[PDB]
Design a binder for this molecule. Sequence first.
Ligand SMILES: OC[C@H]1O[C@@H](O)[C@H](O)[C@@H](O)[C@H]1O
Ligand SMILES: OC[C@H]1O[C@@H](O)[C@H](O)[C@@H](O)[C@H]1O
Lengths: 665, 665
Amino acid sequence: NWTEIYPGVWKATVGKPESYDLLKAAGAQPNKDALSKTEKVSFPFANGGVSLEVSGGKTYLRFPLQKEEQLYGFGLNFQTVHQRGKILELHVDHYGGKDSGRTHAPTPFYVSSNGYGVFINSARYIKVWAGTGVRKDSENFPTPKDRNTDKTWSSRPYSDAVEILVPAEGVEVYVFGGPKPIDAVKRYNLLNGGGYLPPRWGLGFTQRVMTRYTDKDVEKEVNDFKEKGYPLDFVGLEPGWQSKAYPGTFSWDKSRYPDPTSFVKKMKDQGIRLNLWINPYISPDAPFYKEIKPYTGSHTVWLGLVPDFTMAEARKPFFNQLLKDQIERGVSGYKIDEVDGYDYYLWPDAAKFPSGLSAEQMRQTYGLLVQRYSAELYKQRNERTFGLVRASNGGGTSFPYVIYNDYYNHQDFITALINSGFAGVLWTPEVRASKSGEEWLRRFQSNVFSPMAMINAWASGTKPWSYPEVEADVKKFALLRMQMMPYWYSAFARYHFEGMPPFRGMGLESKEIKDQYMAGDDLLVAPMFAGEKSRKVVLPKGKWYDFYTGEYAGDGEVLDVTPGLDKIPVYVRDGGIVPMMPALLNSPKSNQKVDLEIRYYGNKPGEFKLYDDDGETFNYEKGDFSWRTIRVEKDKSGKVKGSISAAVKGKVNTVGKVTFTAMTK
Amino acid sequence: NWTEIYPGVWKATVGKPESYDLLKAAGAQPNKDALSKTEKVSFPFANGGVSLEVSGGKTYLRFPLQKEEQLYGFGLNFQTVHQRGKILELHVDHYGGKDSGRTHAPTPFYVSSNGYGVFINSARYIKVWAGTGVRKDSENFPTPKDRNTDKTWSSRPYSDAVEILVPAEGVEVYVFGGPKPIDAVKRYNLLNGGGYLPPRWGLGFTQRVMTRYTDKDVEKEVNDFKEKGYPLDFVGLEPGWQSKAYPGTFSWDKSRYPDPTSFVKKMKDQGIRLNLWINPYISPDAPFYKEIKPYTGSHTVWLGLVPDFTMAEARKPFFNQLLKDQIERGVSGYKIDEVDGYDYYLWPDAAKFPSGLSAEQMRQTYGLLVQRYSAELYKQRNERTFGLVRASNGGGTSFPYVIYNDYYNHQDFITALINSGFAGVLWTPEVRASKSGEEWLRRFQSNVFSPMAMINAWASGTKPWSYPEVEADVKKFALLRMQMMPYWYSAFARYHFEGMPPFRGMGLESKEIKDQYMAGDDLLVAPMFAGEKSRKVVLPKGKWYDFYTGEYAGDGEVLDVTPGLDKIPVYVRDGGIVPMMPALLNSPKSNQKVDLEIRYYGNKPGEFKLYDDDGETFNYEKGDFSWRTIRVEKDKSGKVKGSISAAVKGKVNTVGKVTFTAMTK
Ligand SMILES: OC[C@H]1O[C@@H](O)[C@H](O)[C@@H](O)[C@H]1O
Ligand SMILES: OC[C@H]1O[C@@H](O)[C@H](O)[C@@H](O)[C@H]1O
């Protein structure tokens, strides 16, 4: 039976579900308030064809499909966006070069073009046949043909269902109503708690430095950023901050970091936060080793113990060490590495954990656990965090982490960014190295139109200016990222409050689009790749305007575009609005007013909801935030006319002078 | 507890095993007689380290490894021979281009270089970590190192066990003693019933013809073989013999085969047997469709019903039709196609079968079932068969079928032939098409040193002579195949009686050898590949002689060989013997005496056991067979001296005049 638990959200419990699952692993709390405000809509499967069965130790699910229905999701795929006709086993792993279901966030959630979604709340590995099976008792069984004589004989005849096998005696399933595909995604995300509300400093630029950097090396890099006029909010430290790595001590190396408290404070006094690399695997020389040992798995990763983070006895020593030795010195956050795979690095499924949780369910949720309990340390102190994680899953929407990996195909990086929007996670196509200045700038351009603007120089030692043929353009895109901070922050506020993914695929207001994405509500981004002079851009219905010049670009048509090296193709919807702050080098503080230039595109009257609060604490949870409504139009003479709603009494107000600019002459 | 059930064979039952498994699926009967004659040997795991555990619904197995122990097996792999350090999920499938465990015969049997083997008797998909897991409580846990400072830090530290996960509440495990790796393989094979004893006609040449051939077309091809002087024993008919294919009617097409009884008889009267392509998927127009329908799975393959061959009610209509419409007309055997995969063609694991058998266990054993019940039809009539099958598994050693596939990488074809010897199945690297005459001859050369000498022209329409630059050499290798018939037949007799795989890897009397194999007891085959002028050949200790000239080649060393296009590198052990019959075009009948030239290589006194019987019935089961012992030496003057043991009273005797030839001048 399907219990309508929120508007457009239904829940069925099939058989006897396991006591551990994805939502429970994450400790994911629904945002009831936001959910209650969504439209009531009808059950998406109104005409039967749904079958939920327990048998032979497993749970068999079947959901119907109509002809010309297309599917999206099944997690963080890198080479496919359309999922109908695919066969997958959803299984946490480092991405392996093919979309098989093995990936960093193999979210068991899919979305239909008909405007609904389905989430399977199991922490097991899950098999999916997304319209490949052909059933003899199907209402749509194609007529059998003779391959010997009939030219129309087809190797892939019509399949009318999504079939899913969960290896357990039952499962919780959730179905999400529409009417549009994005509505289903938003409800799914809100069931997960909505997206995290990042700190403003998390949307600034981050530089990760080489593994071997000393505190002195870091101080110098910071000084070079300032001297050269490049923005920077947080520096990423790689494994050499620890006295041992692989496996880890979780303590500052005495030689590379003699005085941690002093170093963390100096960087902070200069506006620079720190984010620390960890993997969660415990060295014998870690100060809590003996205490944690009984609460660790049978198998090690890089010879380090694997904590069973489902046990308080493992959590307390691990997270206490992070709290006391780093967070309390001022460390802003973490990069939770290598909680994904490969199978030959992580523990095998044959491993045993002291809680009794299967190693399979541990593999599926390890990332979720480390995100969960690390984030909680920051929430307890009324401070936001923002960091990186190499694995996540269903249940992880609300965590303050962005996914990254060691793969590097640029096209595929963009495709993953698209799919991140169907998967309830954030993904950054990071910049590390490049053969050429061209590739370096192309990668930097797409990166600044993503959740996290980052160069990860852990091995490369690169900086934004390392490629001199393109350094001036790289600088421009770095400063653009800062200038766009109010646009991104408002987008992330929609992620938190309404569950709206800030980066997502097209047609989420015919053929597969793998290389364009929406970035916030107003911008269509169409990246260039190295070696290309031009590309096609498919524009949805409605008028679009050039992001740079403001000129009319097109409407419901395909463009051939030759942008030059200095531009990433970006197009703004009619009436679209991008609030721009000044090109600050550091994110603004909560007590700081910032002027805004409201760049308004096209001729349709536009409306933007600018989010404002202190940008660093959880005070917004008590209602200390505002949405400032901005409206812009051209008057009868063609001159820009704009308004902003008034600041609200008693609320934080960081909006300075506001000027309006009609970008379309 | 380990019950020693035969000499060098032990059985443990862990937990509660499933009532269906591989041995039961195959109906595999042990050859007690042959097994009782093997040496008693000690239990291979004498020092502990074995763990058999049931937990969380699954069976966890761990077997210890010593340092420098190497592993072989885990089924029919195409790119790897050494299996230590590999991670696999054993899963029946068409080979996918990588050794992941997905393959045609994913036999859950492995062999150690220390001289033992292990077989996991489950029809589930099975996970294997062959010395990749590193356990914290291991006796051999490497010392944790610091990757920040230590150059010796290793990403793959020492693992001391094979770990296997079976998804069931228990399992039967079998362990096989040594002392040598081949001894373990032989016992495994004998537990399965030994290899099938093929008919002599099955070791002749087979031509499969284009799908669209009519009976007239086949008659003509047969006449061309005879006219051109090429050998032929059986012709393969492809899907057009059926009135419908994909899915199938299992009845002769009225238009292409008007008079089946007459056609089958004409071909037979000319010495030519027929082997018929089937897949087991049922057309609505098949004459037994209505009867079988309730005993078929929920899902179809190419819109054909999938019989549950575990039910007598499915077996009877299916196999009765084959019996009455084909076997009783004289059809010699079948090619059981497309019982492997891919996942998007075969039924999904979510399918349901009317017997209640999981679709997983069905996938794992479907090939075994169709081999089993088809072979039985022939045994009931006291006639041997020999054919082809695209899937098999543990339990399938005794079946009269050779595996083939639609992959075509030549190197990998040879590697699969090597691995076939560790996997309890036969594999043929078939010939279909080639870009060049060179490739065509190279492929033909390796093929005639394999279980089945075959061109499969189902799509290509090729014949042995299709490439005129190499046609004379192709002919020579075809006639060689016939001349070598007594050598091959004796090798296959060892397969049946002693479990000795007729094709196998090296070191089965340091580094991985993927491109050489032993063919019978005496011949080391080292194939050339197209584009190569020369290759290395690693010779084991002991003297070796050139197969063609008889000259000394080497001893415990590596050769660089430039054979020419007209030769496949083959080397004969010291004292090795190849009995040669004449270059007949058709296999000899049971009532026929055949002269033999005994080609003796080197100088060590040699001994060969020539197997002899009627070559077509199961009378050998009643004791109507003989082993004729042949001994050859050079006398003090350097002249060949040979003997053959006397024919046995009352037994079939096909040996004619016997002459001896010392190949090494
Ligand atoms: O060794 C440090 C590196 O470790 C990798 O696992 C990670 O993906 C890299 O981004 C970097 O952190
Ligand atoms: O359609 C006929 C063909 O079918 C394939 O599945 C098979 O591998 C080929 O060898 C040939 O039999």
